Every structure is written in structure tokens, then in C-alpha cells.
Amino acid sequence: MLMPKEDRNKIHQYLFQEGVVVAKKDFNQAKHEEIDTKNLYVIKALQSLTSKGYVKTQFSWQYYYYTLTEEGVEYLREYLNLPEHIVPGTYIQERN
């Protein structure tokens, strides 16, 4: 259904600005840790991105680890409209 644009961006920015997201297999939690949006939203935005490539999903004791792929981050640059290939997001970012 409708997950609004200001909720999908704040999922997508954080996956660019962290590079991994963890979540819990517990719906109706309604606020993710470190993201200002629902735990339903972060699971179903990153199950959505997993289907089109872009994110590799591991389950491992009920808690939903997601790891971004290389073709994912080049999607999120034309999506979020960043400078071209300067910021890598965010594995090699600060200490390299």
C-alpha cells in the first residue's frame, strides 16, 4: 500500500548513509531503531529493494540483517540525487 515519500527517503538515505540496516522479525513495532519510521516500513522497503537486486538479506535468529550491494548504491545516487561518485556510502568514508 501507500508508504509515503518522506518515509521511503528516510529509509533510503540511511541505507546510503550506513550501508547496512538491521531490523527485527516483529511487525507492529511501528518505530525502527535509528530511523524515524515504522518497522513495517523498513522491512518492506528493503524486501522491495532485495527483489530488484540492490540489497542482500540475512535472517539469523529473528533479526533481518540487510547488506547493500554495489548495484544498489548506484541506484541510490540517481534516486537521492547526490554528487556523482564522490560520496561512496559509507563503508570507505571516514577512516578509509
Partner 1 sequence: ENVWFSHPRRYGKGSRQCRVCSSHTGLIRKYGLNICRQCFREKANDIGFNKFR
Partner 2 sequence: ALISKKRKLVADGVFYAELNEFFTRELAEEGYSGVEVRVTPTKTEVIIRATRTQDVLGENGRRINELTLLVQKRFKYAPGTIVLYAERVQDRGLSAVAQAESMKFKLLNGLAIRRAAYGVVRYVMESGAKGCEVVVSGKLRAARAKAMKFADGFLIHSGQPVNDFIDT
Does residue 48 touch RNA according to CB under 7 A?
Answer: yes
> Is the backbone peptide bond immediately before 90 cis, with ω within 30 degrees of 0?
yes
Does residue 31 touch partner 1 according to CB under 8 A?
Answer: no
Nearest alpha carbon to residue 32 among 60, 7, 6: 7
Does residue 25 touch partner 1 according to CB under 8 A?
Answer: yes
Give whichever of 56 and 87 is closer to RNA, judged by the CB atom. Answer: 56
How far apart are the C-alpha atoms of 32 and 91, rounded to whole Å?
22
> Do 12 and 76 meet the contact criterion of CB atoms below 8 Å apart?
yes
**Min. distance of Cβ 93 from partner 1 in angstroms?**
33
Grid coordinates of 82: 547526490
The site string for RNA over 3-22 (x = CB under 7 A, - otherwise) reads xxx--x--------------
The residue ranges that bind partner 1 (CB under 8 A) are 25, 28, 61-62
